[PDB]
């Protein structure tokens, strides 16, 4: 009765960071081993838990959030961070317990000419609460004149595209990202081996 990690990690397409995916994982036994000695990740940063010492514990739920950002922004997927991603797209809590796994995916998510299927929110009046998802596409009003859903001066479509090109420097290349959150409340239904 294994946990469906590969469905998340090995997806063909990953979500846009502003519309990030969340896989709810429950009623299963988790082999974290496939993750933690894997050799194909470039970032694997855990907070308050070790991936080794999880097989003893049992959780009510695990959440696996996934999206694509550029390499320079991977450092923002961490407690206490700020920046366009942490403030307006995906926010971890200050007391976040779990793991941020990331890996370069230039070979899959950039096209020659540019891959503009990946979007981020550039404009937002205030910061996301932790684990907030904002999929609004309302024209953003940068001055006092309301926009009436029409683009123009001080009236901006809030999303921008990444335009990933395989020749970009590593910091401007696409990275796939999975965030593992652990929640216990309820009966514990996600368990490590033994």
């Amino acid at each position: 009765n294994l946990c469906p990690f590969g469905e998340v990690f090995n997806a063909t397409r990953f979500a846009s960071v502003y519309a990030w995916n969340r896989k709810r994982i429950s009623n299963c036994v988790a082999d974290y081993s496939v993750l933690y000695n894997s050799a194909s990740f470039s970032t694997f940063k855990c907070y308050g838990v070790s991936p080794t010492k999880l097989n003893d514990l049992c959780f009510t739920n695990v959440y696996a959030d996934s999206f694509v950002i550029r390499g320079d922004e991977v450092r923002q997927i961490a407690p206490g961070q700020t920046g366009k991603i942490a403030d307006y797209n995906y926010k971890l809590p200050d007391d976040f317990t779990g793991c941020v796994i990331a890996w370069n995916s230039n070979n899959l998510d950039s096209k020659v000419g540019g891959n503009y299927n990946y979007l981020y929110r550039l404009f937002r009046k205030s910061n996301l609460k932790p684990f907030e998802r904002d999929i609004s596409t309302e024209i953003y009003q940068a001055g006092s004149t309301p926009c009436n859903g029409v683009e123009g001066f001080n009236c901006y479509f809030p999303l921008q595209s990444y335009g990933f090109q395989p020749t970009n420097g590593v910091g401007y290349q696409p990275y796939r990202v999975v965030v593992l959150s652990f929640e216990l409340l309820a009966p514990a239904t996600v368990c490590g081996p033994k």
């Epitope: 320079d72 700020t82 920046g83 366009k84 403030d87 307006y88 540019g114 550039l122 404009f123 937002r124 009046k125 205030s126 910061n127 953003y140 009003q141 940068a142 001055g143 006092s144 001080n154 901006y156 479509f157 921008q160 595209s161 990444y162 335009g163 090109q165 020749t167 970009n168 420097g169 910091g171 401007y172």
Partner: antibody, heavy 117, light 109 residues
């Protein structure tokens, strides 16, 4: 749309100055607002930016000494400068940034800051 | 941080000619993150182009931005005496971004 700066003047090394930037036509609390400076005959230096949601960022050359902030009611952006050094001497502009959706399209007129004994 | 290196340091061209200004990034950033500005004596800078090629509002056709990766070009066609200024590139891929050091374009005569 106008941005108008004030508060520049002469100040001694180690001293403090607070720059002000009044805005009409954009809402400062809704925008990426920046401070960009230009030493005499030297080229633009982007020193600070404030995000609509409150996050602040600094160039390394002023990190620790300058604080960018705002007053949503006054529609005013501020640059609090401490431990001023001679190399801070420059004209300071505020500007509104749009990144991939526009330029730094609105700029102020400049206020001159001289750091000398 | 990303350094922008502009070239050459100065241009000097007759009215009607075409000026070619280069900007080289220390790292290949992609066209979305780059912009060009013009600063006339005693004025704040004025935006010309953003996202490498998108001309800003009120900016005539003579100003043309191009390039990708780490290399970008501002072309000013059909030069006039009024085009004397210092032109700057800027990258806003980081917070804050950075400006190139400027190319002064003198109008020959």
């Amino acid at each position: 749309v106008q941005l108008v700066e004030s508060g520049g003047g002469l100040i001694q090394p180690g001293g403090s100055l607070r720059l002000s930037c009044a805005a009409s036509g954009i809402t400062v609390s809704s925008n990426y607002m920046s401070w960009v400076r230009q030493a005499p005959g030297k080229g633009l230096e982007w020193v600070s930016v404030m995000y609509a949601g409150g996050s602040t960022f600094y160039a390394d050359s002023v990190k620790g000494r300058f604080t960018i902030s705002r007053d949503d009611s006054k529609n005013t952006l501020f640059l609090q400068m401490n431990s001023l050094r001679a190399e801070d001497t420059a004209i300071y502009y505020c500007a509104r940034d749009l990144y991939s959706s526009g330029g730094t399209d609105i700029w102020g007129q400049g206020t001159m800051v001289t750091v000398s004994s | 941080e990303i350094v922008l290196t502009q070239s050459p340091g100065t241009l000097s061209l007759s009215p009607g000619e075409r000026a070619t200004l280069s900007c080289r990034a220390s790292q290949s950033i992609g066209s979305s993150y780059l912009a060009w500005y013009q600063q006339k004596p005693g004025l704040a800078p004025r935006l010309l182009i953003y996202g490498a090629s998108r001309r800003a509002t009120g900016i005539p056709d003579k100003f043309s931005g191009s390039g990708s990766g780490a290399d970008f070009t501002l072309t000013i066609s059909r030069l006039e005496p009024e085009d004397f200024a210092v032109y700057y590139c800027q990258q806003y891929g980081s917070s804050p971004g950075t400006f190139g050091q400027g190319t002064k374009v003198e109008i020959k005569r």
